[PDB]
Nucleic acid binder design. Sequence first.
DNA 1: GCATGTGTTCTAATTAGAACGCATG
DNA 2: GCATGTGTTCTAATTAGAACGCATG
Lengths: 174, 188, 285, 285
Amino acid sequence: RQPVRVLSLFEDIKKELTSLGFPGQLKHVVDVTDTVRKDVEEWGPFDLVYGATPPLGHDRPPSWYLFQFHRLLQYARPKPGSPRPFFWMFVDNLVLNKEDLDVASRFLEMEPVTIPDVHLQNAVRVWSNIPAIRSRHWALVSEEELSLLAQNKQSSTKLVKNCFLPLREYFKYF
Amino acid sequence: MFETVPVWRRQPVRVLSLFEDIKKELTSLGFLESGSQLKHVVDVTDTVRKDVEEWGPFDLVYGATPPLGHTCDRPPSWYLFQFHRLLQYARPKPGSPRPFFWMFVDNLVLNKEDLDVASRFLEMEPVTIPDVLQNAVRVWSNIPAIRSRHWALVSEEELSLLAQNKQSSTKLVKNCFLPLREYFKYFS
Amino acid sequence: AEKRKPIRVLSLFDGIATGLLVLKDLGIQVDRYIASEVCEDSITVGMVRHQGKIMYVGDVRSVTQKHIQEWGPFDLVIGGSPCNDLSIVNPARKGLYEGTGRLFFEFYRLLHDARPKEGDDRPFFWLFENVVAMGVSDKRDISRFLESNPVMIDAKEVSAAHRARYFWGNLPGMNRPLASTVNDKLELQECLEHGRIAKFSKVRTITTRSNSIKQGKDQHFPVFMNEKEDILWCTEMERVFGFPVHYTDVSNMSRLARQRLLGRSWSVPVIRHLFAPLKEYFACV
Amino acid sequence: AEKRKPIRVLSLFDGIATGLLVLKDLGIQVDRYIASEVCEDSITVGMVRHQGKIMYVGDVRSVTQKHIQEWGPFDLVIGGSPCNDLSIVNPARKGLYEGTGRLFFEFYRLLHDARPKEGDDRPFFWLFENVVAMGVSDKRDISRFLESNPVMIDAKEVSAAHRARYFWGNLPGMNRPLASTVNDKLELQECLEHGRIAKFSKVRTITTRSNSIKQGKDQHFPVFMNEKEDILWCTEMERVFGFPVHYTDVSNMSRLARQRLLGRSWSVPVIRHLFAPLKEYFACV
DNA sequence: GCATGTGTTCTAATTAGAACGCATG
DNA sequence: GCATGTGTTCTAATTAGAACGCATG
Ligand SMILES: Nc1ncnc2c1ncn2[C@@H]1O[C@H](CSCC[C@H](N)C(=O)O)[C@@H](O)[C@H]1O
Ligand SMILES: Nc1ncnc2c1ncn2[C@@H]1O[C@H](CSCC[C@H](N)C(=O)O)[C@@H](O)[C@H]1O
């Protein structure tokens, strides 16, 4: 089980991936506007491609992050026949409106999973080809409460880092 | 057909009078013997060409709009168009020996646009014959002495006024037939 | 004479030059085609579709006898005066002697001026068209002034629409029955564009009123398209009337302006039938 | 030697089916022409003018990866996404990422879905069109997503109108110099109806704004006709764009609806110049 | 350069639709 | 008989024209 090479877009995840126990093997790019195919190729192969919209209330159209993610994700795929395991994950902090969410599902060719935090408090949506993210039956949470959470957030991460958790099988730990 | 002919060779005029009868006028002037020549027709709606030919050759075709009052059963233009129709019916063959005259008289019933139509169909502008402004009439005809003489000028503004007084409701006016005396026999 | 000569035509109330279209289609050579018309859209269609062959002379009431003698002689005098004061579809019609009805007498006047003098054997033809749905008194008076009884011809026999029209004239064989020719389109279906279904075999009389294209007391839509109701398109009305497709597609005219022109015009195959025996009397390039 | 086969085309934002019109003009056999379009006026023009050849599949956002593979393989993928939020003629444009501007990425998506897999060397051509007069970053971003720079082609050199457009793609010889042909109407005078005088050689870019048919800051009338000035007619706009005359005369559309379609459409001779080399790769008539 | 533009919006004119109409074959 | 009609005049909906805009080749 080889280590992991991660391409990080917009948001750095070195601090979250160090507790994960997953030179450096993480390429982090802030804005990807002038990032062409050869640039992504030159950054070596990748096993995990991560991308996520900025926190609620932080400069760019929300769809931009999604479209640019898709573009670089296509740049970073391996050969058609599968040499090893390839993983990608796009995370939204509820910035995306109803329109943007359906665009997100159309381009990534799958429905999103809703990630809640209660004991609503903080929530996150996730598009991913990880079979482990999908089949976990998370506690059901709807939009109406997520919306109220957003409305109450604009007036002003854990299990999402456990969305990283089931990647431990794939690579060396610690 | 303009030229005058010697007295003895002239014939008693054959007259077609439409809408209004003028027998009394022509008789008083002496165009018709007091022993009864003049065909009078009130409604020409069903009158065809063969009827007119059957009614014998004509020398004078007369037409006149009814005088101001309720006597206007038909639209004012009806009299003009019908007059034109039957006039064409009664024209002599082109090498015609005798003089052929026609006349249309308006007693001011005709509005401006209808006057324009009348002049267009008869191919000439009317003559205003004022007898006084007591009375006045507009006259279309191929009779030279009528288009030639210079009567007193009358104003449309003055004439619209006569129309109003006559709507509220003679000798010299009957001199439209005067210049015809030298063309037909005269009885007296 | 010696040989046939190109025809000389006086067209009163010419509209969209249906007469010239029909003369051209029959191969009849045209010396001159003088048209009296006042509508700008009509004049534009005639100017464009016939490349300035037509000599336009404006209002019919401005046509003097001196003009007829100078522009002539004419071999053919055709026309169909306005009927918006004659047709009983207009509740406020003013009759033959008022409004636009009296424009008929202008035709009677010019026809009289156009006729050859006494002793002139030369062939002379005239045709006057108007509607059947008029007063019995106005029909009577028209017959009297034209000295002839009309022939009733419905375009339904020779086209895809009801159009009962009276025709006064002296054209050879006006009285003969109408035989359908190979080229005629007798059903509404033949007039529709691709992918359109006719709900009716023949449509009714098309007027300038927008919804004259709807059928019956119930005002039904004439065609089906994609299982939805629809009216006739302009190109389709043109086929129904017998005009070439896009004949009226000129001067950025709207559907209303086009139907206004079509609704006043003659059914082309009817005029073709009436004009057909004239090619014997005139040159045929 | 394996014979050439008829072409298989996916057309996104088809409009009035200019693509199919050009391909048929070049004599290229077309097996299937699958088009994505939303505007009912556009679809109607397409259905009628091509007699129902086009398979309409509706909104581009409803076209899936699986549908592309099931309807394919495609030889040619063409499209021109809306520019009402791209063109700098709109002071209220919302940009490439909002409004109708984001529809561009739908083309980008489906293009990727239509590409042959690895190891597949079969010929695959594509073309994307939009305006020169757009934001700098928007042109860059489009170039970034398509991984290509555009060729600039102005219709002015092959027709009677200015129209500077960007073309992304891999068509054989897109860069190559343009050449005049026998049926290239370079002058406005050649586009006008009979009896109408052209005041200018070329006209400026025609848009959905009606007065874009007038010229200059002073908004001059382009044409002279019979003692008056006039704008272009629908037929003349069609000729200016290189479409067949009366191409858009369908479904009772007004001048504005027709110019709305033309305003968005491609310049036909330009598309012919771009599609011409495809004659070598596919079966011909 | 600086003047041109796959558009949007607002106003008066037209459109497209519908009511109204009754004498006529 | 009873449906029909080369029309006219009402509406709410579109059309046709003009003002607005300023970054981009
Ligand atoms: N005063 C006038 N002088 C000449 N034409 C007139 C006129 N008043 C109305 N018209 C025209 O007379 C026409 C009557 S409708 C007849 C049109 C023609 N028969 C055709 O087949 O197209 C209308 O086009 C109208 O524009
Ligand atoms: N969501 C969508 N799906 C499919 N077509 C769409 C769409 N949104 C807009 N369109 C269409 O995209 C077109 C862009 S204009 C392009 C027209 C075309 N290139 C031609 O030659 O005519 C418009 O016709 C518009 O109706």
